[PDB]
Amino acid sequence: SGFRKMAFPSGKVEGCMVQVTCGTTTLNGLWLDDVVYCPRHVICTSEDMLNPNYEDLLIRKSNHNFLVQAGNVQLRVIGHSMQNCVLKLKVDTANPKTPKYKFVRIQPGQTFSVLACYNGSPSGVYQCAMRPNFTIKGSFLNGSCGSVGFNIDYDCVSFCYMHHMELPTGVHAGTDLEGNFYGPFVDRQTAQAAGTDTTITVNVLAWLYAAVINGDRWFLNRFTTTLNDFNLVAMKYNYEPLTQDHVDILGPLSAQTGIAVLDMCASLKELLQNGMNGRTILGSALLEDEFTPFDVVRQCSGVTFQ
Amino acid sequence: SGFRKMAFPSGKVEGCMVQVTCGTTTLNGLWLDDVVYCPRHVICTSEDMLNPNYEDLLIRKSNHNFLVQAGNVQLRVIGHSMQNCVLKLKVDTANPKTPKYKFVRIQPGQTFSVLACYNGSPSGVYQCAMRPNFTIKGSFLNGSCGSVGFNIDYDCVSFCYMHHMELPTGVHAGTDLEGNFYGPFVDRQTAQAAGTDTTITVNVLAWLYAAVINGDRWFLNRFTTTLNDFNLVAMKYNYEPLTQDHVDILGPLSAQTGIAVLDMCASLKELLQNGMNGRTILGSALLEDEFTPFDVVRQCSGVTF
Ligand SMILES: CC(C)(C)c1ccc(N(C(=O)c2c[nH]cn2)[C@H](C(=O)NC2CCCCC2)c2cccnc2)cc1
Ligand SMILES: CC(C)(C)c1ccc(N(C(=O)c2c[nH]cn2)[C@H](C(=O)NC2CCCCC2)c2cccnc2)cc1
Ligand SMILES: [Cl-]
Ligand code: NA
DSSP: OOOOOOBOOOHHHHTTEEEEEETTEEEEEEEETTEEEEEGGGGOOGGGSSSOOHHHHHHTOOGGGEEEEETTEEEOEEEEEEETTEEEEEESSOOTTOOSEEEOOOOTTOEEEEEEEETTEEEEEEEEEOOTTSOBOOOOOTTOTTOEEEEOGGGOEEEEEEEEEEOTTSOEEEEOTTSOBSTTOOSSSSOOOOOOOOBOHHHHHHHHHHHHHTTOOTTOOSOOOOHHHHHHHHGGGTBOOOOHHHHHHTHHHHHHHTOOHHHHHHHHHHHHHHOOTTOOBTTBSSOOOSOOHHHHHHHSOSSOOO | OOOOOOBOOOHHHHTTEEEEEETTEEEEEEEETTEEEEEGGGGOOTTGGGSOOHHHHHHTOOGGGOEEEETTEEEOEEEEEEETTEEEEEESSOOTTOOSEEEOOOOTTOEEEEEEEETTEEEEEEEEEOOTTSOBOOOOOTTOTTOEEEEEETTEEEEEEEEEEEOTTSOEEEEOTTSOBSSSOOSSSSOOOOOOOOBOHHHHHHHHHHHHHTTOOTTOOSOOOOHHHHHHHHHHTTBOOOOHHHHHHTHHHHHHHSOOHHHHHHHHHHHHHHOOTTOOBTTBSSOOOOOOHHHHHHHHHTOOO
16 A cells, blocks of 8 residues: 655666766766767857757767766777767776666656766656656756666666756756657757646546555546547646547556546546545645556556455 | 655665565565565464464574575575564675665654565665654555665665554554664554654755745745744644754755745744645645755755765
8 A cells, every 4th residue: 555656776777877078068978888878968068058060069079088987987988979969979898787778769648767866976766757748847956967767667777868958947858868859859058948738637547546446435426428528628727638548548447446437537527626625635635647557557556445 | 956756776775685485475685794684574374463472483493494585596594583573584695785884763754765675676766754653654565575764875875664564544664674663563463553643844844945945935924933933833733843953954944045944934834824825835735744854955956875
């Protein structure tokens, strides 16, 4: 019992974090086999930040312009290349702590763990979600660039996010590990702003199912709804549309609890209308949207508290 | 910018988790130097659990009745003893991944990270607080016993919690690493219950400072109060008393933000008496009490390990 914002154990990622320095700029890199991955903006100077030409900046660098430090050990850079917005530094040593891993690009609504790092050293771990507006609501200070997000379902580390920048509202933007940004953002200082964000409806529904599994039913009601009527209401509260794909992926939770998906949708409609009237759900007075259906099944019992 | 519920990096503890099996029971142990620590109730059968005599059960066990697995390697047990509610299994090999560590007993209101494990395998990490009623609001399923809680300082891991049991309300009870329970609980299937809990006032104040640092200021006001006046309000709302030591500990955050503690207490007084009037603080509609002053300073300043 209980229900927490739960991250993956971070040790397999800690063993890959290194410090990368170019010029006066230091940030974090990810050391996998004989490659170090980091944000390409490590090669920018103070006058280059509005409109850097990264191809022109990189051709002026030699391998020995990049200082890579793994704990106390300096690694020797023997090659470099750029892939989209990520720099790849080939080093002369394969990381002996490289885990089984892959690179995955995620979709909005998906969750992942973040290992926040400074100067190549880990600070803390927390859970995040890719928001519908392609930002993440992280906790990141100056020097955190190159920190990564990941999942570890089944002993393989899936890296899905590398941190690049903070936007004016205090939320965060970055890339997959192939260097492609999430959303319309660019690694330039030119003015950029997140779009209006929305609530991840399928995740709210997953979390209401988690509450039922853990023994709470006060918010249920005798009603149902059609899918289209639900979406007409939910969008008036800045909720994302619920698709038939979402209905399908909620099937297992629906079967475990005996509550049809569109019946739970009718409960959510009433909660938006009424509030909680001084009650809480799983320790929150707001509707939580950063737990996915997969997360709920990973954390909750397979036996409903009836 | 931003403020999250943040755990310590768990790698130093992951390398210490093992699987311990006795009879039909499998749970988790902590392997440090040449000793594996786990809950003593691993030796109980279902009948034993109703009214157990732990010394009697242990003398009939031989070292080979304890199966200890580090990954896919069996460790050989060469001795066994009990300390309070913890079993200590001496093994023939020192853990090469033992970190610098200490055992510490924490106070109510202090926070720590939990590494939830099953079958000796780390599964998740989250941040908790020791509640004033000496429970923790964890997330634990069957098989989680022996999971541990910890803090880190530079390179030293301070272990403070070992998980033993769930209570009927779904909160959790356990021991320090010397086997002393937190709270008035016992490791036996008998009627037990969490007591009425209270809110950790000094931690709520710390989180209001975190909010100000992150630009959330709507709850600030021109007023101040006194420790005596505020504590009469705290008692009314089942908040823990605020001491002068708590005020002193918040001093750095008061200097950084320009809001004296008793000034912030007047904000908290008004939030308790009036609510949030539909607004949120750091993305919460409740007053959060599982960040300590130290946690706020650490996350807002980027301390590494
Ligand atoms: C251009 C300007 C305003 C001077 C600036 C601002 C912030 C940084 N960032 C520092 O890390 C950092 C280090 N020293 C000072 N700032 C991060 C940042 O947004 N990435 C920049 C790279 C892409 C172009 C501009 C943004 C950062 C900070 C906090 C949290 N996440 C990331 C860098 C430059
Ligand atoms: C039969 C009974 C009394 C209802 C029971 C309940 C739970 C367990 N516990 C299993 O881990 C477990 C494994 N398989 C089945 N149960 C845990 C548990 O409370 N510890 C017991 C040890 C001390 C005596 C009683 C409690 C547990 C479960 C979930 C989360 N935290 C810990 C054991 C027995
Ligand atoms: Cl006043
Ligand atoms: Na005030």
